[PDB]
Design an enzyme around this catalytic site. Sequence first.
Site, PDB file in Angstrom:
ATOM      1  N   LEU A  57      -8.823  34.418 -28.977  1.00  0.00           N
ATOM      2  CA  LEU A  57     -10.066  34.998 -29.456  1.00  0.00           C
ATOM      3  C   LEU A  57      -9.773  36.201 -30.350  1.00  0.00           C
ATOM      4  O   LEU A  57      -8.621  36.581 -30.568  1.00  0.00           O
ATOM      5  CB  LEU A  57     -10.953  35.400 -28.277  1.00  0.00           C
ATOM      6  CG  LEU A  57     -11.765  34.291 -27.603  1.00  0.00           C
ATOM      7  CD1 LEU A  57     -13.016  34.858 -26.951  1.00  0.00           C
ATOM      8  CD2 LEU A  57     -12.126  33.195 -28.595  1.00  0.00           C
ATOM      9  N   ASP A  58     -10.834  36.799 -30.877  1.00  0.00           N
ATOM     10  CA  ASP A  58     -10.724  38.005 -31.685  1.00  0.00           C
ATOM     11  C   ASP A  58     -11.628  39.091 -31.106  1.00  0.00           C
ATOM     12  O   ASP A  58     -12.332  38.882 -30.115  1.00  0.00           O
ATOM     13  CB  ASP A  58     -11.048  37.714 -33.158  1.00  0.00           C
ATOM     14  CG  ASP A  58     -12.505  37.342 -33.391  1.00  0.00           C
ATOM     15  OD1 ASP A  58     -13.270  37.212 -32.415  1.00  0.00           O
ATOM     16  OD2 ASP A  58     -12.888  37.175 -34.567  1.00  0.00           O
TER      17      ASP A  58
END
Lengths: 124, 128, 172, 12, 182, 458, 173, 64, 122, 71, 86, 60
Positions: free
Chosen positions: K40-41
Amino acid sequence: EPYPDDGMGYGDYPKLPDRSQQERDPWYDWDHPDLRLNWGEPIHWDLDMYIRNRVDTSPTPVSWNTMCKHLSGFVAFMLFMFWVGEIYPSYQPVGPKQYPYNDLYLERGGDPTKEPEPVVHYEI
Amino acid sequence: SFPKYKPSRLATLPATLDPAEYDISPETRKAQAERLAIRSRLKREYLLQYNDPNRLGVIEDPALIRWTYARSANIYPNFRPTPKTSLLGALFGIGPLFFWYYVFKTDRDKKEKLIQEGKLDQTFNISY
Amino acid sequence: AYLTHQQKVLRLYKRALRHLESWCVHRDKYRYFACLMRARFDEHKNEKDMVKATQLLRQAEEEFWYGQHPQPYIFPESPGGTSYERYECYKVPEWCLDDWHPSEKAMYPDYFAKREQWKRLRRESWEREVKQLQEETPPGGPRTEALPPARKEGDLPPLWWHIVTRPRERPM
Amino acid sequence: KRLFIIKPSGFY
Amino acid sequence: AMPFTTTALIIGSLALTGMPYLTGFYSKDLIIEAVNMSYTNAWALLMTLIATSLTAAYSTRIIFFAFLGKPRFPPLVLINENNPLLINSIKRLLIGSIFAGFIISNNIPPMTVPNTTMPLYMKMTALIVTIMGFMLALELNNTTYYLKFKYPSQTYKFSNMLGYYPSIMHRLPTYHNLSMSQ
Amino acid sequence: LKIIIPTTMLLPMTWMSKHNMIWINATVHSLLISLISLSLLNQLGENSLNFSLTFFSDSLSAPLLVLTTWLLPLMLMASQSHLSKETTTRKKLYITMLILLQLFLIMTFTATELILFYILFEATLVPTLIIITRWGNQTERLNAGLYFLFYTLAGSLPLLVALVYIQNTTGSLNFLIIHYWSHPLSNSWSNIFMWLACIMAFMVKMPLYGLHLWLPKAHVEAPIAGSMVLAAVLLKLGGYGMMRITTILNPLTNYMAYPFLMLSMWGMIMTSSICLRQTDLKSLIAYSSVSHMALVIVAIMIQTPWSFMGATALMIAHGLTSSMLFCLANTNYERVHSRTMILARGLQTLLPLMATWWLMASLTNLALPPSINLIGELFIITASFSWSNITIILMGMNMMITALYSLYMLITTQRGKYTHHINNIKASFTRENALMALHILPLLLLTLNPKMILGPLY
Amino acid sequence: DSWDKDVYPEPPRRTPAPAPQTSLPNPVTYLTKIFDLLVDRPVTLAREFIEQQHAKNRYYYYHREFRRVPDITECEEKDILCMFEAEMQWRRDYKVDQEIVNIIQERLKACQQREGESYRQNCAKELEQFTQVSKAFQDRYSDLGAHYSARKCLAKQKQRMLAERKAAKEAAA
Amino acid sequence: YRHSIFAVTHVLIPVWIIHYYLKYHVTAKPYTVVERKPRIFPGDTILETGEVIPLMKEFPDQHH
Amino acid sequence: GAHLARRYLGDASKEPDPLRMPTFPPDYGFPERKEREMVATQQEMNDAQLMLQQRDYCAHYLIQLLKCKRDSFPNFLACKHEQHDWDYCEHLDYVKRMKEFERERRLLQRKKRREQREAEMA
Amino acid sequence: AGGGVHIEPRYRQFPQLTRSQLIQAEFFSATMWFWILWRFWHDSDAVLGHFPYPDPSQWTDEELGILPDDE
Amino acid sequence: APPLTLEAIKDRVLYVLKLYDKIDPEKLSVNSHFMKDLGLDSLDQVEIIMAMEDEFGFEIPDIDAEKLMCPQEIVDYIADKKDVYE
Amino acid sequence: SALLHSSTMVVAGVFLLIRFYPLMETNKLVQTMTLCLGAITTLFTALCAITQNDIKKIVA
């Protein structure tokens, strides 16, 4: 920021920003959660003014000039032509309440001794 | 589009809308460093006295004591009879007192004038 | 200490679509404008130039203040909610317990016996944790409100009593 | 499962 | 999910809106039939006309948002209304909110002049006005179902802040007077 | 006369009694002397109760003495918080001052001579400054004595010159003689200053807007025993004086009243507004006392039957409650060792009964019906309204603020969230709770039949 | 009865005969009869037990009559002796006149409710009695102030006499 | 029994002293309890007098 | 209603001033002035406690309504025809009230017709 | 609170209902629909107006007794 | 209302994270770090916590939001905030 | 909120004027603000209720 020494006895007491306790971040750990106020740090000269219970100056979604203009414009609309309303009353094409016994002169507190002026009304 | 949200004394400007908040720069960058550093020490010794097992007392706040003096006793020691204080003192002093004098005396003489020939009705005004 | 460029947009997004939820109400309506809010958020991901990025903050907030719900939605437990600090009427601090009369502490003997043991842990670990604190404070007090952890075994993390013995969120 | 509730000393 | 409270509110709101031959109608619509036909201030008959339209309007909104529509509440459902204490409490006034209207209207002695002869339009307007109050508000409530963004209207902003009165009157007069106190 | 001798008889009582029995012996005999004092509301009709050549009583005095004789037990247990550590002789001499104080107030109200009244009227000062300055707590208690006494004598002394002048002119100043041998006051310029001299002495011991700097400068720093007695009866010494001295000051009173009642009228809103912005808890009751005390200034000035009844009703009722809020001030101050309002908060979650006493105190000071505060205040409004219709907008606007600061102290201290770092408040002893009970019950159970309280004009 | 129905007069009461034309049983008739036969009787037995006990012993009280004394008018100037007695009678008359207006007010108080919707007519005589009582009371003790006295009331009495006699003299011509 | 034991100490002992209070103390003082005289209508009879109030004259015969 | 529209938007002389009906002499235009009679007399009208607003010309149709209502207690569902007679008289009171308003209106129209014909006849 | 409630707390499903809970729901709904429009059949006049209102043009000058502009 | 145990709350967070389309319903783990392990970010954390704030009803603070990025440490904060103990 | 200021307390203020009705109707002028006050209050209070969100705010 010492208070302006105009003529008052504020002394060297600093001028904290005139911001309410409400604007302080609730999530931040406050030593006094009721006042959202820490320990030892300088407190405002008007802490009671800006406490949560008292006057709150937190920002509003719409501007303060527009805040009052719409409110004042509202009440002005009411009172100004409510006068126009009262000078042009609304009613039905009705006549006076034709009443018996001389418009109930006796039973409306009139003096029985003095003979009333006869108020009578014939059919149509 | 949308003009602005103009701040006032009671409608303050939020930090989100604050331009200088988004104008971060090196010299104010170190200026906000000691804000928390001063706060960090004030949270340290407070907690130290807060959670001391033998602490049976009230942790006096020097800021609180300073506020009490400034708002209770210090006003006259640092008072100065500058001209501004005189107008403010006179306007909020004998001003309203004489204003109510004009209002109250006018009614009292008007009421006394009316009764002395009997225009005012006291048919049932006995409980004076 | 710092709301750097990272969190500002992260907080800005949080207040943005929460207001949108307050606007759209319906879940299907909210989801469409939420992903548009998301898609329009990262359409300019590659914005290495910080000056434009700070500029992109400006058109994020001023219309947020215009576009925020005049009746913003807040859940009860969070700032502005209908149940914030609702139960403070019942949260009485732990120190009021030792004032209980002999009859009152004989009312619940096991808890008081355990409470006494809890008081013991504070007493002979306080001098250890303050000493542990002092040897690890930087000069001129601490530079950050964060507390150091327990360095070695046995000693509790410094300044632990009130944060541990804090009254429960649902005291009754 | 019920928990002990803290209260001010009401005996006095 | 909660039918007992559903039935109570609908017929409770219908009395609030003036459903004919209910508790509300015998007073509210009789009142509207009385005020409009009298020597009174000109527009002053139009709030009670317009407000009745708004009186029905928020009744539809409260029914539509709270009970109708999709279940937007948190996923974990703990809802329950099967406790007899609730069911009896609501039911006690429920037969009241259904049958009281008659049992006060007939027994009390006549103490007001009865409105007997009037035009047809304003005699029914006590019931008509609530109809577009039901109708227009229903369409406006349905606009939330129509899949399109809602622009924040200036008049909508006015209504959300309680018409701006609490914002100002609780800020300016209280600050100035108490600032003078110091 | 049967009250005074036992009151003096308590002087050997406390001074001799055993080291630990001095307070027990003093407390009981102060409680027993409320018997013989309680037989002073026992009253004939319009004629006053004259039982001796030099001593007399009436329906105006009768509520006053039973207040003072009742009062002394309240300061007796009130002082039993901070006099324990003092030496025996100092403890004995504290009772000496309180008992000496009783002997004075119990005698001013019974005095049938203007000078004898005045001699004892200002004689009560000497016991006071001993209490405020010797047994005071803060630093500026020294400045408290100078402010209190110099303010009093600066007005009392011209009254003494006025009294002897009346002595030479008409012959006597016996309260009955001046009433029966009344003489209208001419509008001569000399009579104006004689009128001003007669009234000013009671004005200073009746906090007026401007002549009230000693109110926050004495009550706040005085000991607890001295605080209530100075606020409950001492402020009323002028109240008794003006109700009596006005019998010889007519018709000059009506024309000369405008500079004075109006200053009370405007200041009574101002002084109440002061309480809205305060930082010291004890300063609240001091300033609240000023506004309530200034209310009866208008009532006596109108010289209206309703006003006099309302003045007497508020006079005793305010004294009872103002003393009460001073006890509640003491308990919170003792526990926290500070007088700052915002320091001790959320005390109701720790002391629920003490909150109820705080509730009853502030709510009675709020003057709701049927409490004696309301009936006294309402009678003043009706009399003032008859005098002028605009009076309602001012004195009514006081009730605006009166409800505000009365609840403000309740909310910020008892209600809210407790401050966490205060680890000093214990459970309240039976002393203060009984002290509060002995303050609240006489006020409430007087409400059923308050006609002992309205006054002679009732 | 205990009072007198001339100074506390009560107009004769007329109550219609119960004539229930409907066939279904009248409930109100039922509530009174259970009320009378379950509560009214036991309190009556308690009262009659009280009355016979109160008749076992009979202690009495009487009326305190005060003989007339010279008022402040014939009282000698600066004569304290008869001034005290003159003042005493004047204030005692004030109490008596205070009760007189109370009696009229109570008569007026009862009249309005008793007449109900038609209170305007069968209470006009009561209103007239209150009007002259109030008017004469203002001619008597009123406006003297807090420290009212017989001399002050005599002063107002003289003021009326000088004004009315002078006005009558010039008007008659 | 719960209903009856509650009733006697909450609805019987009050009316015991309440009825004692009015009928023998309050009503013993005149003008304390004052009653509306029941509205007599043309054709009613009085229990004490017995005289009937004459019926009002012939109606104008209004029928719909 | 319509009368308000003509009075306010248009000329107000064609519409009677609502505080003044009747202005023209009732006798003129109404012969055989056997004036509106009363079937009830003020004695029983007072004895039957009737509020002044209810003390209208329909008095006879309230008193007997109060009678049967009291005698039929607690059968509130009865005494409807007597109630039916009550609002019928009040209806008749209302129509004759309309007749008075329109009679004034017609006289007002005629009063203008009489004057201009007499005015510009030369 | 205690395990064994008359309704069990489920997650994200339609909550269980008891038959008795439903019976009163349409009982009052039916009676209210009975009440509001049975009395409609009884005295429909109330929401109809018992007396028609004639417009003031059709009345002839006979009853009004108002002569024309002739004499 | 019955309280939620550590197993129950870990089970509740297990459902919502598994429902997420960005993650894969077989790689999910209680100690799996969001931005690295699940890929994810930073601008995926924000929508995670509101989806966590939704079914729980309360609001985790923003100051504690950026560091609230581990499923085991997810439940640790919530369990601390509600002091619900099995 | 369901008992005090929804059905009982708030209506007590209206209960004062009705209890004084035999005296109120004598003065024609006093009625003009009663129509004025009650009118605008109905419009304003309903106006807020239209767009409010709190479950109790709408009904209050």
